[PDB]
Structure 1
Amino acid sequence: MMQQSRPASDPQVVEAARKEGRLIIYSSTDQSSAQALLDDFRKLYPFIQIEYNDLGTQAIYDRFVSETAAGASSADLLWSSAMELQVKLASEGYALPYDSPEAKNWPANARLGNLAYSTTLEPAVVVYNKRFLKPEEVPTTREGLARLLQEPRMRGRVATWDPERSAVGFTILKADYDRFPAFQELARAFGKAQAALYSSTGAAFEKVISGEHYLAYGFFGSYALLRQRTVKDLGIAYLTDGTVAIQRVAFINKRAAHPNAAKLFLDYLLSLRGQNLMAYTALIFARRETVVGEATPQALYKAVGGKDKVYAIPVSTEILKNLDPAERMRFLTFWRQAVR
């Protein structure tokens, strides 16, 4: 649905983007998942060449800060799941202020005024290998997963984030810790099962697919849906006690060489066309409710047993509390003691 519509970017912005002719993206969205968006954007605007830099969340931050400080060529658009890092940059002078004509109905907690925008509503899910755990054996609660991880067969068979090496692994597990008391019991059960910690979804998924691990906790439902299309052994379980949802944050570099191309791409991501392509084809869980496909808010809400079971991390300067050293210290001390 909406596959032929045109985002409402101002015609002067389209003409300015044509004069630029190029768009440099730094993104943590795996290119496997991003590629259909890039292809569809080029169908709309064939006069823009896209350079897609598929990078780690901490690496995007470090590279962009370093390049900016050097006065050097950097990204036009930054698109990352490490919400706190994106909100920090966009609240420190790095962002081009732009009021997207596609974001008029965004809630105030899904945008930083005109500086940065939510593009997705992506759940942290459980993935497992059906050869080793049947669907009916996989709990959908933190307390139930804690019980499963007492079992001898689960020792060495669990993957989760390393929040000390992945910035979004921090986002997700910090939010879980903050919102769900049962997270503490589950983290001790990660210690019991000798959970292996990964800095990327692909590294954890490769282990689940090989059966080195049976179950991975906290990775993106978007990537799981897309992997399941080619790996029929991959199962997905949604948490019914409460689901953390991240919002991938996009903003335009204030110092972009191609700011208008970046405007068009932001407006594309936020548009009904882009959000429908997420939900239907890319299998990225869309931010917009008015979407058709597998990767939709309605589908997430049905899977978890209602919208009130989803904690959507806001695109807000309030989330920078998570970067406070004492707040980071409390979480990481708890984590490191529980998972050892």
Structure 2
Amino acid sequence: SRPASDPQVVEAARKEGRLIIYSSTAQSSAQALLDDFRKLYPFIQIEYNDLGTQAIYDRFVSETAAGASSADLLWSSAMELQVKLASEGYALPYDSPEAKNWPANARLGNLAYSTTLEPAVVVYNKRFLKPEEVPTTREGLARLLQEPRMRGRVATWDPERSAVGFTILKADYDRFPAFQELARAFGKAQAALYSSTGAAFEKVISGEHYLAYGFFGSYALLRQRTVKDLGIAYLTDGTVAIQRVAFINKRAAHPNAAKLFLDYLLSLRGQNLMAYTALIFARRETVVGEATPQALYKAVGGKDKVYAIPVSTEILKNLDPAERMRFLTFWRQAVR
């Protein structure tokens, strides 16, 4: 199919001829979306900047303050930092014709959009933990992490170096009491903390760690295709899902190309490519592939077991000084 972007937007994008993206989405995961978008619009040259979540925010803020050339479109899993920018005058307001059935809690009006529904999962090395040895609950994981063989064998986010690590672990801490017992077991097992999914996965795949907690199901599914010893367990006591937020730079030199790419990401065509080929867990329910809401809900025991972090200014509470102090003070004491 073809995204329902307005014909006048398509022609204005052709005049621009160019699209600059700042994205946290691994190029390995995004590449099939970029390639399909270029098939749709061969007259748009894409510059894809694969950057850390904190670095996107810092660089966009600096470039905008200096009046400098910046991104047309920002796409990031650090939901608080995306919602912060889009609620502070950095977003081009645009009603996507592809987002008409987006729930209100999946969009910041016309300022920013959910593009995914990606679970925080457990990945493990099947050579060292068999599927049946991996518990699917926080209390069961706390129990496994008491075992001497697990000491040195756990990876999780560093929520002080990854903005999305913070998004995920803060939401886990807020929603699941059992997260506290688990975080103390991170301490017991001397969990190593990583600022990126790839650094954690590299150590699970070598076997330096047996298990990684809290990383994206999308990246786990894509890595599984080339690494057969990679296992994925879905939490059945409650799964946190992030929504990667896209918005258009208000000061985009190529606003119309950004509109076409945003529409593409929200379209059936783009969400189906996520679900089927990129193995990015899609936001749209009416998709076919492995990385779908249907598949996620089946793995966790139902939709009610998924806490989907909303694309809302309410989540800026996570950036409040008192709220970061409570979370970090507890976190640092538990995992030392």
Q: Deviations over 1:105-153 (max 9, x none)?
A: 0000000000000000000000000000000000000000000000000
| Superposition deviation, residue 252 in structure 1 | 0.1
| Superposition deviation, residue 200 in structure 1 | 0.1
| Superposition deviation, residue 101 in structure 1 | 0.1
| Superposition deviation, residue 6 in structure 1 | 0.2
| Superposition deviation, residue 18 in structure 1 | 0.2
| Runs of at least 4 residues off by over 4 Å | none
Q: Deviations over 1:283-312 (max 9, x none)?
A: 000000000000000000000000000000
Q: Deviations over 1:136-179 (max 9, x none)?
A: 00000000000000000000000000000000000000000000
Supply the distance in 2 between the matched residues of 1:11 and 1:325 (Cα, whole angstroms): 46
Supply the distance in 2 between the matched residues of 1:290 and 1:281 (Cα, whole angstroms): 16
Supply the distance in 2 between the matched residues of 1:169 and 1:207 (Cα, whole angstroms): 17
Any idea what SS the aligned residue of 1:191 has? helix
| Superposition deviation, residue 53 in structure 1 | 0.2
Any idea what SS the aligned residue of 2:297 has? helix
Any idea what SS the aligned residue of 1:86 has? helix
Residue 132, structure 1, aligned to residue 132, structure 2: no
Supply the distance in 2 between the matched residues of 1:337 and 1:193 (Cα, whole angstroms): 14
| Superposition deviation, residue 204 in structure 1 | 0.1
What's the Cα RMSD here?
0.2
Any idea what SS the aligned residue of 1:197 has? strand
Supply the distance in 1 between the matched residues of 2:7 and 2:237 (Cα, whole angstroms): 47
Any idea what SS the aligned residue of 1:63 has? helix
Supply the distance in 2 between the matched residues of 1:296 and 1:46 (Cα, whole angstroms): 28
| Superposition deviation, residue 228 in structure 1 | 0.1
- Residue aligning to 2:49: 53
Supply the distance in 1 between the matched residues of 2:127 and 2:18 (Cα, whole angstroms): 46
- Residue aligning to 1:191: 187
Residue 276, structure 1, aligned to residue 272, structure 2: yes
Any idea what SS the aligned residue of 2:246 has? strand
Supply the distance in 2 between the matched residues of 1:212 and 1:55 (Cα, whole angstroms): 26
Any idea what SS the aligned residue of 2:20 has? strand
| Superposition deviation, residue 230 in structure 1 | 0.1
Supply the distance in 2 between the matched residues of 1:67 and 1:212 (Cα, whole angstroms): 39
| Superposition deviation, residue 33 in structure 1 | 0.1
Q: Deviations over 1:85-108 (max 9, x none)?
A: 000000000000000000000000
What percentage of residue pairs aligned between the two structures are identical? 100
Any idea what SS the aligned residue of 2:75 has? strand
Any idea what SS the aligned residue of 2:127 has? coil
**Equivalent position to 1:85, from 68, 81, 85:** 81
Structure 1 spans left out of the alignment, 5+ residues? none
Any idea what SS the aligned residue of 2:93 has? coil
Supply the distance in 2 between the matched residues of 1:297 and 1:100 (Cα, whole angstroms): 21
Supply the distance in 2 between the matched residues of 1:105 and 1:297 (Cα, whole angstroms): 15
Supply the distance in 2 between the matched residues of 1:14 and 1:188 (Cα, whole angstroms): 53
- Residue aligning to 1:44: 40
| Superposition deviation, residue 38 in structure 1 | 0.1
Residue 201, structure 1, aligned to residue 197, structure 2: yes
Any idea what SS the aligned residue of 2:241 has? strand
Structure 2 spans left out of the alignment, 5+ residues? none
Give TM-score, length-normalised by structure 1: 0.99
| Superposition deviation, residue 210 in structure 1 | 0.3
| Superposition deviation, residue 223 in structure 1 | 0.1
Supply the distance in 1 between the matched residues of 2:25 and 2:257 (Cα, whole angstroms): 19
| Superposition deviation, residue 63 in structure 1 | 0.1
- Residue aligning to 1:258: 254
Supply the distance in 2 between the matched residues of 1:307 and 1:323 (Cα, whole angstroms): 27
| Superposition deviation, residue 45 in structure 1 | 0.2
| Superposition deviation, residue 84 in structure 1 | 0.1
Supply the distance in 2 between the matched residues of 1:236 and 1:17 (Cα, whole angstroms): 41
| Superposition deviation, residue 268 in structure 1 | 0.1
- Residue aligning to 1:94: 90
| Superposition deviation, residue 188 in structure 1 | 0.1
Any idea what SS the aligned residue of 1:53 has? strand
Give TM-score, length-normalised by structure 2: 1.00
Any idea what SS the aligned residue of 2:330 has? helix
Supply the distance in 2 between the matched residues of 1:167 and 1:331 (Cα, whole angstroms): 14
